[PDB]
Structures are given as structure tokens and as C-alpha cells.
Design a protein around this ligand. Sequence first.
Ligand code: HEM
Ligand code: HEM
Ligand SMILES: ClCc1ccccc1
Ligand SMILES: ClCc1ccccc1
Lengths: 145, 145
Amino acid sequence: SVYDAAAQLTADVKKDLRDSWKVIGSDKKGNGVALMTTLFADNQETIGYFKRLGDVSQGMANDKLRGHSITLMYALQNFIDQLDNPDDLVCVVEKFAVNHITRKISAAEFGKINGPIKKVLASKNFGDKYANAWAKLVAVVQAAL
Amino acid sequence: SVYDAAAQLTADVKKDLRDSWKVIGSDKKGNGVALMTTLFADNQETIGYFKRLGDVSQGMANDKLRGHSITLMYALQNFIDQLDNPDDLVCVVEKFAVNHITRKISAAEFGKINGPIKKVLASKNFGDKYANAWAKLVAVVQAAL
Ligand code: HEM
Ligand code: HEM
Ligand SMILES: ClCc1ccccc1
Ligand SMILES: ClCc1ccccc1
């Protein structure tokens, strides 16, 4: 279950998540747009899903993409803040899962975000250990998809 | 005009928003659910829109309502963090406006949240001064609906 995937996030994993988020989450606009542009660059097949955002190749200049990207970072802020209470983490994860289920995003497709996360983490010198930690948090969402 | 509405957030208004948010934003789960339960209690005609959440009279005990309420508080956190840059504030406000336009929520009905906000603020010893400041931020969203 989602609870099982969440309840498994250990003290060490939570530490790495919080330490990396302190840095990446400090610039939500910059890193949020970077995450999305990287997703579109490495997984061009996902571009069609974001038709509401217009021309995503516009990057930062695209107000709709910017608004979406900043908001996405607060979804992650939400997750990070709920780490010590699995019950709260689960209910917020399920809420966001619905937002993606309605768009027909499968657990496998959601996992495509791991590549971009790893790259942005590397841009701030956070290695594989950190990418693995984030993959575990992403896996909690996947349990709900 | 969302841009003219954003221009109404003067130095004094921004300060009041930040000062009150420091207190109420410190307990997103508690105050978020309080805001929702108050909305449903004083404006029963809006409950129909929240069909997905199930039995909202259960309050904190309802997992979907709790997840929704916590997330709503991060939408407000987002707005507060964008106060320095009107261009970014506008793009995130328009993003959330779409979430409500799709639910058939008009500017007039969105405005029904002002009552609950004033009541919750009052219970924390924040008077009309603060309620009016928040009404100005809510007005920015209304301009986009
Ligand atoms: C860290 C992972 C991710 C997070 C935290 C996240 C967060 C969000 C948020 C907060 C929204 C707005 C929901 C709404 O207002 O309805 C959104 C929308 C969306 N997401 Fe994600 N997302 C993630 C990964 C993905 C991935 C990998 C895909 C696709 C392969 C995806 C596809 C979508 C689509 C299509 C939308 C709708 C965009 C629109 O039309 O506004 N998401 N996401
Ligand atoms: C401070 C004011 C408000 C804020 C910041 C706010 C924020 C939000 C957020 C973040 C969501 C989730 C969006 C999504 O995932 O699609 C949401 C959903 C929703 N909001 Fe609001 N909202 C506010 C006031 C209102 C009011 C006054 C109404 C109705 C009179 C309203 C009706 C809805 C409805 C029907 C949903 C969909 C719930 C669901 O089915 O999951 N909102 N709101
Ligand atoms: Cl700190 C992990 C991360 C989150 C969002 C974007 C890029 C990296
Ligand atoms: Cl600080 C303005 C506020 C936000 C949420 C609930 C009550 C008041």
C-alpha cells in the first residue's frame, strides 16, 4: 500500500531528502523550470500531455509553464514537510495522485521524473545517494498510481 | 484585471499578510481544516462542489478532506512567497484560477471564503485589519476567475 511505501522511508533517507531540498527548494522557480525543461528534453513523448501550457520550449518566458513549475515545487515542499507523519504524507500523496490519474498518467510514466531529478541534483553536486533517496519518495506516489 | 488587483498589494498590506501568515501558516493541517469546516458550516450551499471529498462533516477524520486542506495551505504559502514579484504572483494565481474555473467556481462564490478567513483569524486574535488584507489577496484570484 501507499502507507507501506511511506512508512518505510527511514531516518537516513529522510535526512538526505531534507538536506538536498534545503538547497534545491530554495530556488523553486529556477529549479522547478529546470526540472520541467529537462523532462521535455529527455522524454519528448511527454510534451503532448502538457498542451495546456502552450509552447514549453519558451522556458522561463512562458508564464503558464512558470506558474506550473513553481506550483509543482510546493507539492514537493508539502511532501517534505509531512515526512515525519506517514498518515499526513499518505493523504497528501493520494490527493496529488488523483490529479495525475485524471490525466491517465501511469505509475511507470510518473517514474520518468527520476531522470530529471537526478540531473538537477547533480547540477548542485548531490550524487547518486541523493537521487536514490528521491526515487524512494517518488515510489510512494507510484504506489498510489 | 489581475494586474491592477495585484497592484493593490501595497507595502502595508504585504506586511499584514506576512505577519498573520507567520502564525496561521505554522499549523497548516489545523487551520486548513478549520477554514474548510467553517466554509461548509456557514455556506452549506457550497458543499455540493466538494462531492469528491465525501462526508465533509467528519472534518479532520476525513482523509480526503485533510489532504485537500493541507494542500490548500500550500497554495497560500505559494502566494505569500511570490509577493515580491508581481509577475510571478500573477502566473501562480492564474494557475490556481484554472483549477477553479474548471469546477465552475465564479469570482462571487470564491469570495465566500472571506467570511471563514475572518472568523479563523479572529479566533487567533487577528482583527478586521488582517481580514481586509487577506480580502485584497483573495481579490487577485477573483480577478482571474
Ligand atoms: C515529482 C513529480 C511530480 C510532481 C510533484 C507533480 C506535480 C504536479 C502538480 C502539482 C500539478 C498540478 C495539478 C492540477 O492543478 O491539476 C501537475 C499537473 C500535471 N502533471 Fe505532474 N507532477 C510530477 C510528475 C509528473 C510526470 C512525470 C508527468 C508525466 C509523465 C506528469 C503529468 C502531469 C500533467 C499532464 C499535468 C497537467 C498539466 C496541466 O494541464 O496543467 N506529472 N503535476
Ligand atoms: C483561499 C481560497 C482558496 C484557495 C487558496 C483554494 C485552493 C484550492 C486548491 C489548491 C485546490 C486543489 C486543486 C486541484 O487539485 O484541482 C482546490 C480545489 C477546489 N476548490 Fe478551492 N480554494 C479556495 C477557495 C475555494 C472556494 C471558496 C470554493 C468554492 C466556493 C472552492 C472550490 C474548490 C473545489 C470544488 C475544488 C475541487 C475539490 C476536489 O474535488 O478535489 N475553492 N482549491
Ligand atoms: Cl532536491 C530534488 C529535486 C526536486 C525538484 C527539482 C529538482 C530536484
Ligand atoms: Cl493567515 C490567513 C488564513 C489562512 C488560512 C486559514 C485562516 C486564515
